[PDB]
Point group: C4
Chain length 395, copies 4
Amino acid sequence: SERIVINVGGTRHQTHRSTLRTLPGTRLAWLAEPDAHSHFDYDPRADEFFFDRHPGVFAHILNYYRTGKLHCPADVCGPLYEEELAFWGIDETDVEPCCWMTYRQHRDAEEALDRRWQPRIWALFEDPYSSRYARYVAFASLFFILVSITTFCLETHERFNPIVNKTYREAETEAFLTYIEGVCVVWFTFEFLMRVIFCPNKVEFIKNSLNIIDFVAILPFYLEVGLSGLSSKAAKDVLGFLRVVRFVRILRIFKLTRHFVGLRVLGHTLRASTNEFLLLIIFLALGVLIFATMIYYAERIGAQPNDPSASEHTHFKNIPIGFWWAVVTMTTLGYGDMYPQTWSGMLVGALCALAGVLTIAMPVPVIVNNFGMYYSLAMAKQKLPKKKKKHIPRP
Amino acid sequence: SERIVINVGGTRHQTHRSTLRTLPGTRLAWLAEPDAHSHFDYDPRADEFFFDRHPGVFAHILNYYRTGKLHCPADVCGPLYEEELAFWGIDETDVEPCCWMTYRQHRDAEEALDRRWQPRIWALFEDPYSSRYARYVAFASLFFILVSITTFCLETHERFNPIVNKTYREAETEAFLTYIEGVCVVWFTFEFLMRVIFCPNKVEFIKNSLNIIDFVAILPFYLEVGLSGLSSKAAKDVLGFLRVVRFVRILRIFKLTRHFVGLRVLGHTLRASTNEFLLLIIFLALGVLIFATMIYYAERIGAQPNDPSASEHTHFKNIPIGFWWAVVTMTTLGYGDMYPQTWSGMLVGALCALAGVLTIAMPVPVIVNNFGMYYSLAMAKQKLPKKKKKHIPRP
Amino acid sequence: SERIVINVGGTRHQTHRSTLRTLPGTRLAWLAEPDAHSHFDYDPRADEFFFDRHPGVFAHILNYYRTGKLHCPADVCGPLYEEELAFWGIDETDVEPCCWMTYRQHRDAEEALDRRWQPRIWALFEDPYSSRYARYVAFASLFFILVSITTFCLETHERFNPIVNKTYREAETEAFLTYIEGVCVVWFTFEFLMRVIFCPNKVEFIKNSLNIIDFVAILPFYLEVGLSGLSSKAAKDVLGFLRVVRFVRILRIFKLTRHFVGLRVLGHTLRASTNEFLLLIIFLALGVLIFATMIYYAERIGAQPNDPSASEHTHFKNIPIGFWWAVVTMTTLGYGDMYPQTWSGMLVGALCALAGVLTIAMPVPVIVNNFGMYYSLAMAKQKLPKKKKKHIPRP
Amino acid sequence: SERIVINVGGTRHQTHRSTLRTLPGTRLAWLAEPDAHSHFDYDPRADEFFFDRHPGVFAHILNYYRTGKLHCPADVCGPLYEEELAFWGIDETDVEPCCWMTYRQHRDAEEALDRRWQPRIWALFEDPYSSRYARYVAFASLFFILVSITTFCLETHERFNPIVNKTYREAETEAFLTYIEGVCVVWFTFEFLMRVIFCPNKVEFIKNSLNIIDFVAILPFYLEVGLSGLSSKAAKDVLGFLRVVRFVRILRIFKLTRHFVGLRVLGHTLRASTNEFLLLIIFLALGVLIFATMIYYAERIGAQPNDPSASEHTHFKNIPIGFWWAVVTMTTLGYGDMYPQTWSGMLVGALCALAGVLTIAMPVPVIVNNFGMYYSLAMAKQKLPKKKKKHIPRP
Ligand SMILES: CC(C)CCC[C@@H](C)[C@H]1CC[C@H]2[C@@H]3CC=C4C[C@@H](OC(=O)CCC(=O)O)CC[C@]4(C)[C@H]3CC[C@]12C
Ligand SMILES: CC(C)CCC[C@@H](C)[C@H]1CC[C@H]2[C@@H]3CC=C4C[C@@H](OC(=O)CCC(=O)O)CC[C@]4(C)[C@H]3CC[C@]12C
Ligand SMILES: CC(C)CCC[C@@H](C)[C@H]1CC[C@H]2[C@@H]3CC=C4C[C@@H](OC(=O)CCC(=O)O)CC[C@]4(C)[C@H]3CC[C@]12C
Ligand SMILES: CC(C)CCC[C@@H](C)[C@H]1CC[C@H]2[C@@H]3CC=C4C[C@@H](OC(=O)CCC(=O)O)CC[C@]4(C)[C@H]3CC[C@]12C
Ligand SMILES: CC[C@H]1NC(=O)N(c2ccc(Oc3cccc4c3C3(CC3)CO4)nc2)C1=O
Ligand SMILES: CC[C@H]1NC(=O)N(c2ccc(Oc3cccc4c3C3(CC3)CO4)nc2)C1=O
Ligand SMILES: CC[C@H]1NC(=O)N(c2ccc(Oc3cccc4c3C3(CC3)CO4)nc2)C1=O
Ligand SMILES: CC[C@H]1NC(=O)N(c2ccc(Oc3cccc4c3C3(CC3)CO4)nc2)C1=O
Ligand SMILES: [K+]
Ligand SMILES: [K+]
Ligand SMILES: [K+]
Ligand SMILES: [K+]
Ligand SMILES: [K+]
Ligand SMILES: [K+]
Ligand SMILES: [Zn+2]
Ligand SMILES: [Zn+2]
Ligand SMILES: [Zn+2]
Ligand SMILES: [Zn+2]
């Protein structure tokens, strides 16, 4: 008589058949049919149906059935409630906004985070420490990347570019640094040559950004060597262009840091928080423009309409330079190259400081907390090494 | 015999009729009446009343009945407990302070966040991307707003105001920038004219701050054009005033950013955190005044009562300038235009730095966390698109 | 037979009499006695004892009885668990460290936050807005405090102290500012005189820090007026001392801000977080000393043992000045008056920057979070105005 | 018939014997054996097994049995769930990543935080305040450490090193400071001598870093005294070396601060967050290198290939100095000694500022939150003094 008792894991839940039918197409709606006594596990003597599930969360699922809103309990995790909803046939997109984010947190974080000697030669990058030879190769690669970066940094130092007035007063970098860069080049191009020759999935290897970086890093030395024969003025200009391009040597440390879990988590966080990064950029641009205009106008209060001497006493000659001042003041960087010198400009700068603090504190915590989730999940996955399931599902 | 059993969703709750009557005027108080056996769903054989509700939270409601204090469970959400309290007749303002904020969080966040061709022409701003023509119009508006802002920023640059000594050594802005601003004006005033002519709810349209901004942005060009005919000295002064007013061009980017969810969430957060903003302002003012006075006095320790040379060795000539120093030091901005040069002033500046850090870290986290709630709720509402209810309430 | 059933709010809990006796002196230990059948509410037919309490938390209390450790459920609040423990006779100091802080949070926050016309005249400060006359008096007091502060700030400005060379080239402040300070004095001393004459609890009134501040603020004007008659050189020195003491005028704004809930919450937070403030001070001192010594030594690498020219190229002449540099660099203030100019000093300064960031981020979040608790509780108490209890305890 | 009822603390849990056998080797798997009726507490009349445990968490353990995933309820603490899992034979390493971190938090924090007169003389450092004589000794040690640090700081001040041109224009520190350092030395070496003579566990005492620091602090004075007799030029060089080593006096304040709970918690946090510190270091190095290169190239846009005058207008002569600029800009320190002066360098500096803010805000919150856990746990352990257990385990 409209009375149905559901025994979920030893706990008897009593509700109405109309309440069960309120959500058609689900297991509890099917149970509310006159044929459930034969279509389900039914007890004639006890006059109740049995279910080997978790009653505590069945209570909340039946609360959805009863009221019309699907919430999520805070005493169990999202994955557990998801398994129970899947078993009961409840659509997980019915979760109310008051619980959706907490319910999805873990799944969202997981989504964000996720010849016979030819294989041996291709194993040079895969777990280099696994083999002694590959570990030694990795150590040599670290040496020859650090040395290349050091040579690139030193080539710009004035000590290594004494001015030669014989050939014409121009500068000339020392040749020993070039020789060290050359030995770096020969070793690193040996590695690149073996990687390119012994290369499965050629399309993927070419598309690989790290390999592209390696190729564009090795190109300039060869191009400079070849073009030196031409020894033309246009060849000199192209040599200058090649020197400009030589900066790609610093990008070979991303290969070294590619195995770092913190770096991978940071990359995943950057991919996930694109909206927050765009929000930060837009906020910063708005504040920069507004405060540059405000300081420009506050530093000219009481000035003549067109007198050129109005701008002779203020660092803020124009609004574009106020942009730089505003970004520096908003980031609390405060270089001091430009600062207000009037009372009105002083008030404007104070407002700029507080506004920058607040507008940067708006989305940076969101990005930081996303990074926290992803880092914690990665560390947990490390601390939980793969092992036997220990559980046998039913035949 | 004073013993009453309430069967809430299959779970039997046993309490005393005096306990039920402790809260008069509620459903459980009515149940505690001699006529509940006919006024409610009663089972003579089982001698208990049945309720198709959530027992887990009925336990806490009955705990309110039993002890006298209404708390809120942490295993269910505020909206769920609110529905249950509403059904049971419990006043939601009885929630104790230890649980009120958590119970209300979601509702507070939601409150904070909340001719035949004439409609087609009025659809120019409503979902411009919806129609191809309106999307093109929006692209053109973006172009003509960015170009206007660029021209306004460039007019203040010294490169575009060569000094003319013929007519009288004064500055004169280039005319090509004025011409580009003029084409910007003609397009934007075409848009404004159509918006004003085809305008439902004229009162609302006039009261609209964005439309007011548009009108005050278009006024100065027309006023300068008209007043140039007068060519009087007072007309020149009014032209200078119009140049000052010309700054309202930068306010036309708020129209572009008005569709941004981050901007709307920021606005809602600013509306909600007025108390925290006032607290921040008052704290900053107190600290600024106190530390300006303290540094003024610390830089004059051991000085003569009236010797004018006492202030010749310190940046802190007066307390008003100490205000600027104190705000700069409190925000950790540290421009460096003024800094203590004595030991006592050094100690005072250190105290200013720490005090500013703490007093700014007091309410900024509150504002940030409010922003976090509102942003998370808005993102959840986006991720949860409107769909079928999927639930049928009882006839 | 060692089997006892406890019916707590309709839920039957079955345990052993030895388990109940494991904690002597409590209600459940008494229940485990052969005389509980007459000393408690017992049901012979059902063979169980009845209790009109919350079973969900009785389960955790019985878990304490069973295992030996008292924990606190996260599905209910600390006050609720406290009431239940008090009823069951459990000592609340048995709570394990894994739950003690969460259990106590709310109570700790509450502890931190906590003639016939003679009363009318004494009501001048109590809710001044309550009476129209008192509100007008408060407005006048605000006016005469702001004006006094403005006069005090302006007296130090060079515009108001033109140098008089007739009487002897010394400075002399303008007399109109003194006259305005005098009218401020007469009004404020009228208020102070009425407060002192009509004064209940004279001991408390004298001990009041705000009234002490008022008296020390009014003293210097009278002392300067009286001592001007002496017109002696020692009198001039005492006049200079009185000018130094005149700074106490800025302390009369604490009276205005004493009614501010944010200010009161800040005071409570300062009282509560004394340990964290001491930790911050000690950390800062350690880092300052260490980094001052480190930078002093890093700026003298390769220098002569005693050559005086070693310190001619570095801002770090000594360690005491390195203290100032270190505090400025640790607070991320970066004035720029002193900075490393060597590679070793540069590394030391970088280490100082990161170390300061971390050591300041250590306890500042603790203080901030305490402030957050207290502010949230105060706002909740405001949002929950006093009303009828609505609940009637049993006779 | 495949139906088994488990009565856990008065609550009847009904499941299948196959469900119980899904996890072999556990208590519930043993219960699912035909001999459980004699191997466990069984009730023939009621046909159920009894367990004096917590049903609420038994429900989640049986949910593990049922589904195959072990989660952890959020309504109870990690230690409680750990005791229950241990009783039921469940491996605590089966906890899913969605709950592992919350389940382990407390245990991880605890792991991170963890003659007859000869003993009396050795009690000089153990609870010095316990005995009056030891408290006086501690006060004297504080005096003689602070005075030594003050003398060390003052010896580098130019006031105490007047230049002597008689003996040869070199500097000479005052002798009274040396005499005060000598009395400091005699007292502190008395303490060290008694500590070394009366010393249990000599190996541990020698290995103690604080005692090593004490010995290396006392060595230089004796070495300078002894070597002064030689009075050789090489002896003068070794005297300069000893002056350099004299810096170890500042390390004697770690002994004073070794009893501070905040310092111990900081040390534990540093030990625990090694991964986060390495992440911070690697992030900072990557950003510093990248932004130094970027600013170097942005300040030379449009410059000649080799013209020496290209670097005459920019602070960024090389990339190594850009390293210093980049670290200063990333930490928001902003000294101002070097800043971009071009538009491209300005954009690069802005990007550096935001990138530094974000990359420093990534792991610093993790370290801060670890510190928060450890500090809260230490304060809780203090607030919970050792007392009687009050609970008697079963014979
Ligand atoms: C420091 C910088 C970031 C500027 C300061 C930020 C806020 C103080 C302002 C700047 C832009 C403002 C927004 C600009 C325009 C709009 C659209 C406005 O909606 C409309 O105008 C639609 C029509 C109407 O009903 O008026 C709602 C507020 C909002 C989001 C504003 C909220 C407040 C904002 C974020
Ligand atoms: C850096 C700036 C913000 C100043 C430093 C802030 C705090 C160290 C001080 C400044 C003002 C102080 C408040 C000024 C006056 C009062 C009113 C006082 O109450 C009374 O005086 C009422 C009568 C009495 O019982 O004395 C309680 C403390 C409180 C809030 C003080 C708490 C401590 C405060 C916040
Ligand atoms: C930037 C400033 C704050 C200095 C850097 C802080 C930490 C890197 C150091 C400085 C002082 C150190 C503490 C100084 C001395 C001790 C006592 C030491 O215990 C003993 O020496 C007792 C006897 C023994 O077993 O050795 C335990 C570590 C601890 C707290 C140290 C932990 C690491 C600390 C906090
Ligand atoms: C301001 C500094 C810290 C530089 C900016 C940081 C991020 C914008 C960049 C710098 C280094 C990047 C990482 C460098 C290389 C890799 C390895 C890459 O994996 C591979 O290349 C493996 C082969 C392939 O499938 O391509 C995955 C992304 C990741 C972690 C990158 C993610 C994005 C990172 C963190
Ligand atoms: C060339 C004329 C020269 N003489 C003169 O008083 N002014 C002036 C006047 C008011 C004024 O308001 C201010 C003040 C601060 C910020 C600010 C404004 C704006 C222009 C209205 C918008 O942003 N600014 C400048 C001048 O610019
Ligand atoms: C013109 C006389 C001149 N000669 C002289 O010693 N002083 C002096 C003395 C003490 C002194 O205390 C200090 C120090 C630091 C901060 C501070 C104070 C106040 C005045 C009491 C309040 O805020 N300040 C200054 C002077 O101002
Ligand atoms: C007067 C002699 C002069 N010539 C010379 O090389 N030095 C020197 C040598 C090493 C040195 O180590 C450094 C470097 C950086 C920081 C630092 C140290 C300490 C002294 C060991 C402790 O803190 N410092 C200075 C000098 O001070
Ligand atoms: C000596 C030649 C001189 N003349 C000239 O235009 N350039 C130049 C050109 C482009 C350029 O791109 C930039 C700009 C900003 C950052 C940046 C780059 C890199 C080199 C490509 C990598 O990091 N930088 C510099 C010069 O360095
Ligand atoms: K800063
Ligand atoms: K700064
Ligand atoms: K700075
Ligand atoms: K900061
Ligand atoms: K500076
Ligand atoms: K600076
Ligand atoms: Zn919900
Ligand atoms: Zn509560
Ligand atoms: Zn616990
Ligand atoms: Zn889980």
